[PDB]
Design a protein around this ligand. Structure first.
Ligand SMILES: [Mg+2]
Ligand SMILES: [Mg+2]
Ligand SMILES: [Mg+2]
Ligand SMILES: [Mg+2]
Ligand SMILES: [Mg+2]
Ligand SMILES: [Mg+2]
Ligand SMILES: [Mg+2]
Ligand SMILES: [Mg+2]
Ligand SMILES: [Mg+2]
Ligand SMILES: [Mg+2]
Ligand SMILES: [Mg+2]
Ligand SMILES: [Mg+2]
Ligand SMILES: [Mg+2]
Ligand SMILES: [Mg+2]
Ligand SMILES: [Mg+2]
Ligand SMILES: [Mg+2]
Ligand SMILES: [Mg+2]
Ligand SMILES: [Mg+2]
Ligand SMILES: [Mg+2]
Ligand SMILES: [Mg+2]
Ligand SMILES: [Mg+2]
Ligand SMILES: [Mg+2]
Ligand SMILES: [Mg+2]
Ligand SMILES: [Mg+2]
Ligand SMILES: [Mg+2]
Ligand SMILES: [Mg+2]
Ligand SMILES: [Mg+2]
Ligand SMILES: [Mg+2]
Ligand SMILES: [Mg+2]
Ligand SMILES: [Mg+2]
Ligand SMILES: [Mg+2]
Ligand SMILES: [Mg+2]
Ligand SMILES: [Mg+2]
Ligand SMILES: [Mg+2]
Ligand SMILES: [Mg+2]
Ligand SMILES: [Mg+2]
Ligand SMILES: [Mg+2]
Ligand SMILES: [Mg+2]
Ligand SMILES: [Mg+2]
Ligand SMILES: [Mg+2]
Ligand SMILES: [Mg+2]
Ligand SMILES: [Mg+2]
Ligand SMILES: [Mg+2]
Ligand SMILES: [Mg+2]
Ligand SMILES: [Mg+2]
Ligand SMILES: [Mg+2]
Ligand SMILES: [Mg+2]
Ligand SMILES: [Mg+2]
Ligand SMILES: [Mg+2]
Ligand SMILES: [Mg+2]
Ligand SMILES: [Mg+2]
Ligand SMILES: [Mg+2]
Ligand SMILES: [Mg+2]
Ligand SMILES: [Mg+2]
Ligand SMILES: [Mg+2]
Ligand SMILES: [Mg+2]
Ligand SMILES: [Mg+2]
Ligand SMILES: [Mg+2]
Ligand SMILES: [Mg+2]
Ligand SMILES: [Mg+2]
Ligand SMILES: [Mg+2]
Ligand SMILES: [Mg+2]
Ligand SMILES: [Mg+2]
Ligand SMILES: [Mg+2]
Ligand SMILES: [Mg+2]
Ligand SMILES: [Mg+2]
Ligand SMILES: [Mg+2]
Ligand SMILES: [Mg+2]
Ligand SMILES: [Mg+2]
Ligand SMILES: [Mg+2]
Ligand SMILES: [Mg+2]
Ligand SMILES: [Mg+2]
Ligand SMILES: [Mg+2]
Ligand SMILES: [Mg+2]
Ligand SMILES: [Mg+2]
Ligand SMILES: [Mg+2]
Ligand SMILES: [Mg+2]
Ligand SMILES: [Mg+2]
Ligand SMILES: [Mg+2]
Ligand SMILES: [Mg+2]
Ligand SMILES: [Mg+2]
Ligand SMILES: [Mg+2]
Ligand SMILES: [Mg+2]
Ligand SMILES: [Mg+2]
Ligand SMILES: [Mg+2]
Ligand SMILES: [Mg+2]
Ligand SMILES: [Mg+2]
Ligand SMILES: [Mg+2]
Ligand SMILES: [Mg+2]
Ligand SMILES: [Mg+2]
Ligand SMILES: [Mg+2]
Ligand SMILES: [Mg+2]
Ligand SMILES: [Mg+2]
Ligand SMILES: [Mg+2]
Ligand SMILES: [Mg+2]
Ligand SMILES: [Mg+2]
Ligand SMILES: [Mg+2]
Ligand SMILES: [Mg+2]
Ligand SMILES: [Mg+2]
Ligand SMILES: [Mg+2]
Ligand SMILES: [Mg+2]
Ligand SMILES: [Mg+2]
Ligand SMILES: [Mg+2]
Ligand SMILES: [Mg+2]
Ligand SMILES: [Mg+2]
Ligand SMILES: [Mg+2]
Ligand SMILES: [Mg+2]
Ligand SMILES: [Mg+2]
Ligand SMILES: [Mg+2]
Ligand SMILES: [Mg+2]
Ligand SMILES: [Mg+2]
Ligand SMILES: [Mg+2]
Ligand SMILES: [Mg+2]
Ligand SMILES: [Mg+2]
Ligand SMILES: [Mg+2]
Ligand SMILES: [Mg+2]
Ligand SMILES: [Mg+2]
Ligand SMILES: [Mg+2]
Ligand SMILES: [Mg+2]
Ligand SMILES: [Mg+2]
Ligand SMILES: [Mg+2]
Ligand SMILES: [Mg+2]
Ligand SMILES: [Mg+2]
Ligand SMILES: [Mg+2]
Ligand SMILES: [Mg+2]
Ligand SMILES: [Mg+2]
Ligand SMILES: [Mg+2]
Ligand SMILES: [Mg+2]
Ligand SMILES: [Mg+2]
Ligand SMILES: [Mg+2]
Ligand SMILES: [Mg+2]
Ligand SMILES: [Mg+2]
Ligand SMILES: [Mg+2]
Ligand SMILES: [Mg+2]
Ligand SMILES: [Mg+2]
Ligand SMILES: [Mg+2]
Ligand SMILES: [Mg+2]
Ligand SMILES: [Mg+2]
Ligand SMILES: [Mg+2]
Ligand SMILES: [Mg+2]
Ligand SMILES: [Mg+2]
Ligand SMILES: [Mg+2]
Ligand SMILES: [Mg+2]
Ligand SMILES: [Mg+2]
Ligand SMILES: [Mg+2]
Ligand SMILES: [Mg+2]
Ligand SMILES: [Mg+2]
Ligand SMILES: [Mg+2]
Ligand SMILES: [Mg+2]
Ligand SMILES: [Mg+2]
Ligand SMILES: [Mg+2]
Ligand SMILES: [Mg+2]
Ligand SMILES: [Mg+2]
Lengths: 48, 271
RNA sequence: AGCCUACGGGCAGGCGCCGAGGGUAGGGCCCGUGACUGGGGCGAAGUCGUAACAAGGUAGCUGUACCGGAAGGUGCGGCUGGA
RNA sequence: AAAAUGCAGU
RNA sequence: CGCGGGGUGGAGCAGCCUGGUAGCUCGUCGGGCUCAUAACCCGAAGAUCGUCGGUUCAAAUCCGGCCCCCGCAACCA
RNA sequence: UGGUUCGUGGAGCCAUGGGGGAAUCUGGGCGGACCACCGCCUAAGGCUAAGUACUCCGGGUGACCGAUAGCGCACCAGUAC
RNA sequence: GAGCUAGCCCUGGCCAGGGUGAAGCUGGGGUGAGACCCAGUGGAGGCCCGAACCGGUGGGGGAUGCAAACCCCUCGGAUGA
RNA sequence: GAAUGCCGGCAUGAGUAACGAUAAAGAGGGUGAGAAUCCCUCUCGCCGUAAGCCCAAGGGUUCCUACGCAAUGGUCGUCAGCGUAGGGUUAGGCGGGACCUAAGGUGAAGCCGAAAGGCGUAGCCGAAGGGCAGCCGGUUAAUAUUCCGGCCCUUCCCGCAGGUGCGAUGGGGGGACGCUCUAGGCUAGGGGGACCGGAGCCAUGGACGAGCCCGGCCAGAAGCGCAGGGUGGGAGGUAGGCAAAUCCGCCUCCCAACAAGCUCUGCGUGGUGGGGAAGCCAACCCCCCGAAGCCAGGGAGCCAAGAAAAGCCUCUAAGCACAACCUGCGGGAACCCGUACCGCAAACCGACACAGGUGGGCGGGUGCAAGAGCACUCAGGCGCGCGGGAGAACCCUCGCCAAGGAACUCUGCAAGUUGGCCCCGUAACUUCGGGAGAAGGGGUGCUCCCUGGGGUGAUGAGCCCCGGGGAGCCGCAGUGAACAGGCUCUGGCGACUGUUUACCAAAAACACAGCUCUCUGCGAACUCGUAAGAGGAGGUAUAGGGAGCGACGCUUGCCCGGUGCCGGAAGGUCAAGGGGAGGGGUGCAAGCCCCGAACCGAAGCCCCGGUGAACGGCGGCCGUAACUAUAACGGUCCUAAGGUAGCGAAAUUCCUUGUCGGGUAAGUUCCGACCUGCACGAAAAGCGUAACGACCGGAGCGCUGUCUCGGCGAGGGACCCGGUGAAAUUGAACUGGCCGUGAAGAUGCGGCCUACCCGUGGCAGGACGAAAAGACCCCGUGGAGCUUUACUGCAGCC
RNA sequence: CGAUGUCGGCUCGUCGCAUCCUGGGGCUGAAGAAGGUCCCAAGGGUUGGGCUGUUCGCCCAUUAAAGCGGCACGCGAGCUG
């Protein structure tokens, strides 16, 4: 039936955004963590 | 006056709405600096703080004059009596001669085109406001302030009304609608007469809906929840509570007094 | 489409209306009877009290309402058919 | 103030 | 099958913890008061203390075995 | 109340959230309650190398591994997924 | 982590067709005046039937499925909470 | 060599199940190395409120073209959404942005918090809402309101002419609002035509026919009509719009008003531009139906009373009047992003080309009462990416059945009957609405004749919309197929519509209007937060929070001993702290240090009293009536008080299938009764109750393959052949019966018996078959949720 | 207990005999017909409903009779629940 993943761009960008991250101390420390691991994307890459 | 319906459908037989002859004359509220974006929302910064709120018909706000001492001595003609979704009483719209217009919790009797005013002198009668001190010991009165220059706060719902019980110096004693005998400062204003729409207390919602149209979501009994939720909850098989009626938060609900103890607000009470 | 024919006609035969009654369905009135149940009338010497009749030992009666093993009691009002 | 009852027929 | 409480004059109950005394209401019997009956007044009479054994100097009383009574249990399957 | 070895213990010292509240050397704290002796030391401003720590980084080594080991990755790996 | 789900807030959209026929008005009757009674008009309702849409009654099938909740027949709401 | 071990490889099950909707195929041409599967054509079937068109979201080159077939495609592939390469997406007017504001977010000022950070005014951000200028054609292999053609617009800048007190972030108006019902005109859309325009056709017995067949429009400035939507003009005063105003707003004054004018739309018409069927390698007209769309800010009614801001008018402030606006007309200027393609799906969410899920618009025609339903069908799109035979059992889905007719069974579960529209005609009971579609009947097709109103016209023909009567025809049958209630009686529970355990429970559970109790006088009580702040509420006792009950009707007894809550300026106790009698350590001392009794000291608790729609409770044993029997009466013990009404073998009754009565041939169920109620009882309400119910029980009628009891038949599998080809499982196996034996249920030991070797289709007795380190049970000084008068703490509160 | 699915029903049976019928047969308080009891004997039979989840019973209507037990209270990789 109507599964859990209902893709929306404005959502994804706004929830897991690079800006959204930077805005919370918890969110800032997420990036810090990723950059430090070498991930190629930090913020779930989207596009509009 | 309360209108009743025929049984042409259950939940109707019983239902009864408010008679709107008192109002009439004007339906749409006064566009003019009078309505506002009345913001629905059943709770503060996030969590709900008043369970079962919500739903309910869209509603515009009417800013009313809760301190008529604004325009002292300036007399006005009561232009119309309109309906107000925001409250139980009816509000009356009045054009001042000052040009200006504004609303005012429509007192019982106040009639159209009749003139009214407020001042430390106005003819003691329906719709006039004057510092409590100048009002004849006895004469009823609504939209009473509680402290000089802080707006009406007492007696505002259909039928409410306090009575001047007697003077006592800087102060004056009032027997509020609840029956508590309060001492309100002499300067506090208050407009002569009662509130009107007294029939309010008789309308029977009728159906479970309506209760909803008012923005009241079903209210479940503690009894019906589980130990986890409410305290009454739980028990395998319907229960007799289990000593001594309590609220979802703890505190007893049958009799336990709550008003603050050492509230400086005493000293002016009795009842 | 037969018969006798006195031949546009008559009979037989055919179709239709109605039609006794039978059928089905649903109502109404009356009578009988029914576990159980409600009081009622009656029946020589039963059990409990004593309400009423003499200020019946709390005047009586009354419409009503509530209560009580039972008569009855009490409230409100009413009558005198009590003072 | 308080204080009940008296078998059947005759 | 288990864990309980109980048994005493006619009746309904006490004394049984902590032994030597058997208490109360009622009823019963004998007298009064009434024309008489109740009701009232005065005076009594009646109790293997459920049985059997044990303990003690002495047991209804403390101790166990039975015999009858009225309670509560009998759960997961 | 915390810190110390110190868990209220005879509990001093060192900090200090509350109340009260000095003196400037005849001033004032300490020497494990407290007195007295005797002795130490100058609180309520600050600064100060070095010896100490660590290994993203470069180098040298190994009775270290040798592609299921060794870092997760000897390879276009924080990738594919 | 409320892109599922639960509630609420702001703003939009959606609900074939058919039926029943409340309040009101209006005329007639009625009375001292009324209540009221009649037709007509009227078009109410968590009203009725039933598609969309929202469900999930009962049965069967499915059960290494078409599917980690599906399909068939059937059934409830369908101007409202 | 074992850890249901870890990683990897390869086995077995097995050429087995399967190959993803039973909408469906056949053939002839091509192409090629090879074609059931690619291309073409001709038959055939399926969808057609879609299985067709457009738009959004999401996906992201999947688009078009040319080469290709390793793999991907449940088979095949010459094909492709695959690989490789090359093309392809054009905007002042469509959509976003150099506009607006909503929720919400952010946040100068300001408030708060160990830090992190939390609030918060304005402002800012924020869109499917407000605002705003493009229509019809033509082109490409692939883009088009984007390029092109025709017609028509919008801003800005400048010059010019002619106008006027011009001018704000400021003031005012407007923007501007709900739901249900609707008028009058239109348009979209559609149906006809005896008319216009057309290639053609007369077959197979007849028709050269007012024949058949095809099509008879679209867009359109200014002006003009026809529908509407908006709108009083004057002129004086002014205490108001946080006056800066000749604008709003108020009063007063002529005139004027189911209006005119002035405006603004929509629709016709319009110069003119465009398109333009069926057929064999060029008209463009007239009737009729008609919107859920337009005129739109239309109108009525209703109660629950229906965003904001900018654009836009208008008013004045400084300012500035050489500016400036305003109207014209010309010239010029007009950026950024998006635009391919999929888009109910093989390109989106579901690991898959997945029978699931996905918002908005169009959604033709005929018939059936209607309709978005149902059957068929246009347009357009599809036959579902394995096929070919066979015609066993067995399963699925489907059709029919003799006589019987619920005997089936836990249960009529399932299936059958009934089934639309019209007319008759419908009971108890009732809250008078209803029950009611109660039940139970009749009608239903086509043909001819007569005849009634309506709409459009024009009054009159056509064209449509309702009808009424009379004869008559054929069938087994006329809602001739499809969509399409089985009905009644009677209990229980709940009033009722509603809500729930996504994914085993839809209920008698939750909710519900309504009743009661209680809290709360406003910086309310309550909730969230450390706080600031916020909800409560821009409310104010007819209001708000908590609690129980749960429409309505008749009602809701007795017990404050204990418990809770409420009231008690006395008493009793009580911690700091006050107070210091009096004692102690040290000094030679002044002193310094220590203990420390009287008494005074809060809340709380004890204590007094209230309190039941507050927690809660609401008895026993003897006796007695003139037949017995029983006990209205009595005695006695105990209590805080001993269960009232009403109901009662019940969702409650153990004994129990109580015992009577009813229904039945027969009734542990069922209905009515009785009452020794193991163990009903009054807002954890008691007893009832019309109506309602996918709720649970009992009975009848109707009908039936449920059954006596099976039989035949259809199709999709199962079976054979070609093609692709898994799975759990698996110590190894050369894996028979009986009677014993064995850790107690043996293919495997013993004795006897039977037994050539290997498969195929079938059935499930056994392999203590598979699958889950059993849910139950106990064990563990394992764990979690919950509880309270367990312990001990903390928030909170006094 | 790293699972031996647990009542009853339905379907399919098969076995024991301590036999409900039907066949033999001795006693009898067996006249007859019937009955009682015991002996031998399962070869084959051993009904259909009402009530209950029931096994079991109890009834209804028949019968020659309406037997009792075992098979993991036979039988859920056979069904029902
Ligand atoms: Mg969203
Ligand atoms: Mg906020
Ligand atoms: Mg937030
Ligand atoms: Mg509730
Ligand atoms: Mg619950
Ligand atoms: Mg929770
Ligand atoms: Mg709790
Ligand atoms: Mg409870
Ligand atoms: Mg007849
Ligand atoms: Mg009778
Ligand atoms: Mg008397
Ligand atoms: Mg007397
Ligand atoms: Mg008397
Ligand atoms: Mg008595
Ligand atoms: Mg009395
Ligand atoms: Mg009297
Ligand atoms: Mg007597
Ligand atoms: Mg005699
Ligand atoms: Mg005793
Ligand atoms: Mg005795
Ligand atoms: Mg005597
Ligand atoms: Mg003894
Ligand atoms: Mg003795
Ligand atoms: Mg004894
Ligand atoms: Mg137990
Ligand atoms: Mg247990
Ligand atoms: Mg300090
Ligand atoms: Mg010190
Ligand atoms: Mg010291
Ligand atoms: Mg020392
Ligand atoms: Mg220093
Ligand atoms: Mg290095
Ligand atoms: Mg090496
Ligand atoms: Mg090595
Ligand atoms: Mg490695
Ligand atoms: Mg190697
Ligand atoms: Mg959500
Ligand atoms: Mg639609
Ligand atoms: Mg409708
Ligand atoms: Mg009417
Ligand atoms: Mg409805
Ligand atoms: Mg419906
Ligand atoms: Mg649901
Ligand atoms: Mg439905
Ligand atoms: Mg229905
Ligand atoms: Mg709504
Ligand atoms: Mg080993
Ligand atoms: Mg492996
Ligand atoms: Mg096999
Ligand atoms: Mg096979
Ligand atoms: Mg196969
Ligand atoms: Mg397929
Ligand atoms: Mg080739
Ligand atoms: Mg060839
Ligand atoms: Mg979406
Ligand atoms: Mg996109
Ligand atoms: Mg690609
Ligand atoms: Mg090609
Ligand atoms: Mg290939
Ligand atoms: Mg292939
Ligand atoms: Mg392609
Ligand atoms: Mg390609
Ligand atoms: Mg252009
Ligand atoms: Mg903005
Ligand atoms: Mg913030
Ligand atoms: Mg804000
Ligand atoms: Mg918009
Ligand atoms: Mg635009
Ligand atoms: Mg295209
Ligand atoms: Mg162009
Ligand atoms: Mg000027
Ligand atoms: Mg047309
Ligand atoms: Mg022609
Ligand atoms: Mg005017
Ligand atoms: Mg003016
Ligand atoms: Mg035109
Ligand atoms: Mg052409
Ligand atoms: Mg702005
Ligand atoms: Mg101006
Ligand atoms: Mg496109
Ligand atoms: Mg769609
Ligand atoms: Mg897909
Ligand atoms: Mg496919
Ligand atoms: Mg799919
Ligand atoms: Mg159609
Ligand atoms: Mg129809
Ligand atoms: Mg439509
Ligand atoms: Mg359809
Ligand atoms: Mg078709
Ligand atoms: Mg086949
Ligand atoms: Mg048959
Ligand atoms: Mg037949
Ligand atoms: Mg029949
Ligand atoms: Mg029957
Ligand atoms: Mg049977
Ligand atoms: Mg059925
Ligand atoms: Mg049917
Ligand atoms: Mg009847
Ligand atoms: Mg009924
Ligand atoms: Mg009918
Ligand atoms: Mg015909
Ligand atoms: Mg069909
Ligand atoms: Mg059919
Ligand atoms: Mg019952
Ligand atoms: Mg219900
Ligand atoms: Mg419901
Ligand atoms: Mg569920
Ligand atoms: Mg339901
Ligand atoms: Mg369910
Ligand atoms: Mg109060
Ligand atoms: Mg506040
Ligand atoms: Mg309840
Ligand atoms: Mg009391
Ligand atoms: Mg009490
Ligand atoms: Mg008390
Ligand atoms: Mg108190
Ligand atoms: Mg005190
Ligand atoms: Mg108690
Ligand atoms: Mg006797
Ligand atoms: Mg009978
Ligand atoms: Mg019976
Ligand atoms: Mg039955
Ligand atoms: Mg009964
Ligand atoms: Mg009882
Ligand atoms: Mg009770
Ligand atoms: Mg009570
Ligand atoms: Mg109660
Ligand atoms: Mg109830
Ligand atoms: Mg009922
Ligand atoms: Mg329902
Ligand atoms: Mg029956
Ligand atoms: Mg069958
Ligand atoms: Mg067959
Ligand atoms: Mg077949
Ligand atoms: Mg094969
Ligand atoms: Mg062998
Ligand atoms: Mg064996
Ligand atoms: Mg062997
Ligand atoms: Mg085989
Ligand atoms: Mg087997
Ligand atoms: Mg099998
Ligand atoms: Mg197993
Ligand atoms: Mg285990
Ligand atoms: Mg357990
Ligand atoms: Mg533990
Ligand atoms: Mg095992
Ligand atoms: Mg014999
Ligand atoms: Mg014989
Ligand atoms: Mg046998
Ligand atoms: Mg057997
Ligand atoms: Mg057994
Ligand atoms: Mg068994
Ligand atoms: Mg069950």
């Amino acid at each position: 039936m109507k599964r859990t993943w209902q893709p929306n761009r404005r959502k994804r960008a706004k929830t897991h955004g690079f800006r959204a991250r930077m805005r919370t101390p918890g969110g800032r420390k997420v990036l810090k963590r990723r950059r430090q691991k070498g991930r190629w994307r930090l913020t779930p890459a989207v596009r509009k | 006056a309360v209108k009743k319906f025929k049984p042409y459908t259950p939940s109707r037989r019983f239902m009864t709405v408010a008679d709107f002859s008192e109002i009439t004359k004007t339906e749409p509220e006064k566009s003019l600096v009078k309505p506002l974006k009345k913001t629905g929302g059943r709770n503060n910064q996030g969590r709900i703080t008043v369970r079962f709120r919500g739903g309910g018909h869209k509603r515009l706000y009417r800013i009313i004059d809760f301190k008529r001492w604004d325009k002292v001595g300036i007399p006005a003609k009561v232009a119309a009596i309109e309906y107000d979704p925001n409250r139980s009483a009816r509000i009356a719209l009045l054009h001042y001669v000052d040009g200006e217009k504004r609303y005012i919790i429509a007192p019982d009797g106040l009639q159209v085109g009749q003139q009214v005013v407020a001042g430390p002198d106005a003819p003691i009668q329906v719709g006039n406001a004057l510092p409590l001190r100048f009002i004849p010991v006895g004469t009823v009165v609504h939209a009473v302030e509680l402290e000089p220059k802080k707006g009406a706060k007492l007696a505002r719902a259909a039928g409410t009304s306090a009575q001047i019980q007697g003077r006592e110096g800087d102060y004056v004693i009032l027997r509020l609608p609840s029956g508590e005998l309060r001492k309100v400062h002499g300067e506090c204003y208050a407009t002569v007469g009662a509130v009107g729409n007294a029939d309010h207390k008789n309308i029977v919602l009728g159906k479970a809906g309506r209760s909803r149209w008012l923005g009241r979501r079903p209210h479940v009994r503690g009894a019906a929840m589980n130990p986890v939720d409410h305290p009454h909850g739980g028990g395998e098989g319907r229960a007799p509570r289990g000593r001594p009626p309590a609220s979802p938060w703890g505190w007893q609900t049958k009799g336990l007094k709550t008003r603050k103890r050492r509230k400086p607000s005493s000293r002016f009470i009795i009842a």
